[PDB]
Amino acid sequence: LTLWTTLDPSPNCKIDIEKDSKLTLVLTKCGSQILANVSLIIVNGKFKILNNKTDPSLPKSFNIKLLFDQNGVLLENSNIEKQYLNFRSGDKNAIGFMPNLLAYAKATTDQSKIYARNTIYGNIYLDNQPYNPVVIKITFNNEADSAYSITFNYSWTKDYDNIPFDSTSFTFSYIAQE
Amino acid sequence: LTLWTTLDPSPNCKIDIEKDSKLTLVLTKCGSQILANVSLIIVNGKFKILNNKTDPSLPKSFNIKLLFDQNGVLLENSNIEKQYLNFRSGDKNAIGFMPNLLAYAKATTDQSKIYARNTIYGNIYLDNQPYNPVVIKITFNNEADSAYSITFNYSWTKDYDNIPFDSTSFTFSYIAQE
Amino acid sequence: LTLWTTLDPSPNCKIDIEKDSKLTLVLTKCGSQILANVSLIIVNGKFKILNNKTDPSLPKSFNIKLLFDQNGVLLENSNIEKQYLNFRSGDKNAIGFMPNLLAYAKATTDQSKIYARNTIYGNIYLDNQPYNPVVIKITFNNEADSAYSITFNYSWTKDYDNIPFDSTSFTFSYIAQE
Ligand SMILES: CC(=O)N[C@H]1[C@H]([C@H](O)[C@H](O)CO)O[C@@](O)(C(=O)O)C[C@@H]1O
Ligand SMILES: CC(=O)N[C@H]1[C@H]([C@H](O)[C@H](O)CO)O[C@@](O)(C(=O)O)C[C@@H]1O
Ligand SMILES: CC(=O)N[C@H]1[C@H]([C@H](O)[C@H](O)CO)O[C@@](O)(C(=O)O)C[C@@H]1O
């Protein structure tokens, strides 16, 4: 079964301003593993067009945080509202889609950190060009005031000069809680 | 269920000359997502051995296009004939394997382009060496005179000097039409 | 169904010294393809902390070899004992998890080599930093005195200076024997 966003271009996400972006996320449960497919289009706000070269105050990284309550429902501090993830019909409780707590343990301590296995790195590309890389860093169960979390960190090193944040797709998997 | 090529080394593909290559492609339907595994061996023609260094007329990129009719059957202009994709037995209509039209919309207009989410980038390696990279660029639903398409673009920047096009394997996923 | 290690941090692997490492490996059968998720934590021995900069005798690569008998059970020369892979309960014979012999043929001859499609390359990161890359090279069916094999080769080029071998996660797939 599948927990997913809509697939259209309509925004569902706040990075900078309300509804400035569309995170397209498809989570497919394949037994003990979630098969995940993600893309990001930014449609408004300061990250729509990366102007790092002409705006030194613009960040070169941002997060999209899916903070889940114990039930597997999004919490308000997430970048996406809980209504924007639904089950796909005959092809709540979403604990079967949550990142496994034994594989991806929370930091033990204020002064401890997670194991690196809680993280996946990938490279995605802006405006469909191989010379516009962005590092996508996906971390499990590393957020305060949440039962489970999936955090998508987007970061880049190039002083991009009017490049639209229209990202290529990325596939990954993670171990499911149950 | 699975839509796949044969797994042997026998050629099934024309890049340059007839039957000059074997695209090994395994598509596994996992609900709403296709889990895809691809490799390429070039056995004849001008791309069998990359001689860019001693032949400046040789391209540094080529496409393998799977152009599908509405039924999910290959069209003649594809690099592979329709007979070379089959269902795996008790483990036509292949619309369940086709790239989703809402997620991967065609270009609206002669002067418009697709969203970047229609594309996946990866790096694969020739002759099993990490110093022989090739960019594999997979694009959905971006081809003229086709209902659906999967295009594999292979490109490289090194002036390769007698390197066999014997590629490492690559895994990806995409959202299914139905 | 799933063939997996435990998910805790407890070591299950010998790279240098007994039980010096935890390979977390989850293999999910999705019809004709195995969906695979791997991470590595080194907890003891010479690779726990990479000190290449101050120990020129330390290798910059090592293997973790899963050598399978015909039944799909680990052989003693593997880096992991056979007890450390088990089936996940109602969600031996593990031939359904073995790398396909037609897709991933053994070398024909003492002087022959495998096709490159028997290999996957990826990049993973140590201590959750994008400036600590390691090349993960996964090769199928390329080991002496084994029916099937999955070999994880880890290699790096940086003279790492006291970097813990605490790896990020990596997803891949391969074609199943049956
Ligand atoms: C798809 C890909 O690998 N992109 C990479 C390109 C490659 O050089 C390609 O080969 C170009 O075609 O190089 C970079 O340095 C760049 O351009 O910023 C890093 C980027 O991640
Ligand atoms: C597997 C891998 O990442 N290959 C990359 C290597 C790395 O440096 C490795 O670390 C070598 O072992 O570097 C390149 O510049 C190269 O050699 O052409 C790009 C290539 O994509
Ligand atoms: C995640 C990632 O791609 N890491 C790569 C970084 C990128 O430059 C990032 O952009 C840094 O944030 O560069 C390397 O040369 C490095 O630092 O050793 C290779 C490494 O594989």
Numbering used by the authors:
A (entry chain A), B (entry chain A), C (entry chain A): 187 to 277, 285 to 371
Give passages from the manuscript.
To evaluate the potential for these recombinant fiber knob proteins to bind cellular sialic acid residues, crystals of the fiber-knob proteins were also soaked with sialic acid prior to data collection. This resulted in four structures of HAdV-D25, D29, D30 and D53 in complex with sialic acid also shown in [Fig fig1]. The conformation of the bound sialic acid was found to be a mixture of the *a* and ß anomers, freely exchangeable in solution and minimal protein side chain adjustment was required to accommodate either conformation. Soaking in sialic acid containing solutions reduced resolution slightly. [Fig fig2] panels A-E depicts these pockets in fiber knob proteins of HAdV-D25, D29, D30 and D53, where sialic acid is coloured according to structure and the residues contacting sialic acid are shown in green. Y314 and K349 (according to HAdV-D26 sequence) are conserved across all sequences, while the remaining residues are similar, suggesting the existence of a common sialic acid binding pocket across all species fiber knob proteins. Whilst the threonine was not found to be universally conserved ([Fig fig2]), the other species D adenoviruses had similar sized residues which generally made interactions with sialic acid in HAdV-D29, D30 and D53 ([Fig fig2] and [Fig fig2]). Pseudotyped viruses comprising an HAdV-C5 core viral vector psedutoyped with the fiber knob proteins of several HAdV-D of interest (D26, D15, D24, D29 and D53) were generated expressing a luciferase transgene under the control of a ubiquitous CMV IE promoter for measuring transduction following cell treatment with and without neuraminidase treatment. Non-significant changes in transduction were observed when cells were transduced with viruses with the fiber-knob proteins of HAdV-D15, D24 and D29 ([Fig fig3]). There was an overall trend in reduction, although in BT-20 cells there was a small, non-significant, increase in transduction of HAdV-D29 fiber-knob protein virus following treatment with neuraminidase.
Species D (HAdV-D) are the most diverse species and cause both gastrointestinal tract infections and epidemic keratoconjunctivitis (EKC). Each protein forms key interactions to promote cell infection, with the terminal domain of the fiber, the fiber knob protein, interacting with the viruses’ primary cell entry receptor. The adenovirus fiber knob protein is known to have a highly conserved trimeric structure. Sialic acid (SA) usage has been proposed as a major mechanism of cell infection for EKC causing HAdV-D. Here, we provide apo state crystal structures for fiber knob proteins of 7 previously undetermined HAdV-D, and provide crystal structures of HAdV-D25, HAdV-D29 and HAdV-D53 knob proteins bound to SA.
